[PDB]
Protein: bone marrow stromal antigen 2
Amino acid sequence: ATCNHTVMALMASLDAEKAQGQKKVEELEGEITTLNHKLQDASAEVERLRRENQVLSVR
Amino acid sequence: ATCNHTVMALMASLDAEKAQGQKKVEELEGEITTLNHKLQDASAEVERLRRENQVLSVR
Ligand SMILES: [Cl-]
Ligand code: NA
Structure:
């Protein structure tokens, strides 16, 4: 009986541990996706600001 | 005996998950911390290009 009970609880533990983990991984990928967009925007604003700095140096 | 076999497997499993889990979060936290210094810098390259622009605008 003690063994049976322990199997039950571990199985529930392993599920819970997987759920909790996949939840956090996703939300970290979230952050990562968002940062990727932001880096992408500020890299174009640099590309732009830069290009127009050049047309500016011309006249 | 089957139950013992199974409890061992489950206990070793639970440990593996937590470990794989800890490891994937670390790697993600490292990509984040990385993508915050890429954004940190591009986001300054702008505010100087923004200044260089302004002195250049009034010739
Ligand atoms: Cl398993
Ligand atoms: Na499983």
In short: The pocket of sodium ion (ligand 2) is lined by residues A 14 (CB under 6 Å).
